[PDB]
Amino acid sequence: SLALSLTADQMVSALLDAEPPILYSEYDPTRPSEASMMGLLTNLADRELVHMINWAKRVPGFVDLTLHDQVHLLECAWLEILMIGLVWRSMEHPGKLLFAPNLLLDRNQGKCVEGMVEIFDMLLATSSRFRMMNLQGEEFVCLKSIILLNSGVYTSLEEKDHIHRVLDKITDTLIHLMAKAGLTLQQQHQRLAQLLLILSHIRHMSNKGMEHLYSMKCKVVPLSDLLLEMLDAHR
């Protein structure tokens, strides 16, 4: 009942106040391999997963759901949420992806692991896309919560209409923010459409990344037991 009762600014406050921290990697610049970089990124994503799970419980309405539903939404959206966060961190670093403050990688270093290059370029294009749009942090936290609630919603239970009720609320928040920035009604709609079309590409990168991840398993730095469980959820 709380999520439906919040206001637009009350929405932005909770989301902004719920932001997980930017974690550091175990990267050592004294050493340059493919396996080294691969194990670094998966170790970081594993530690980020713990913060995301407790971040999701801070997302308005998410704790009103059954827990079978919370598992499913996170199992389907976790890599999307990691990717959009990475892309947001990298906005002010053209040509580079900021996986962590001590780990800033560009194209040539991303090619060190096979198949990573294409996903690397898609992540760069997304971060560059957020750069042209001048994406605001208030809009980012809104998009990230939309990914959590929308990615698994299409997979008796009255919980779906509640989720869509939360989703419409977040749309009102995004529109409320764009009106504050002095956009016209036509500008608010176009910008709302542009932001949501990015989520289609973020879904695409996630599917591609999830399959390159399941091959890294079958191929060799192992992954954490949490990452393997999240990976079994997609396979």
Binding site: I53, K57, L67, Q70, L226, E229
Partner: peptide, 9 residues
């Protein structure tokens, strides 16, 4: 399920 557990704590 680890995710199931971490959501409980």
């Amino acid at each position: 399920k680890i995710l199931h557990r971490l959501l409980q704590d």
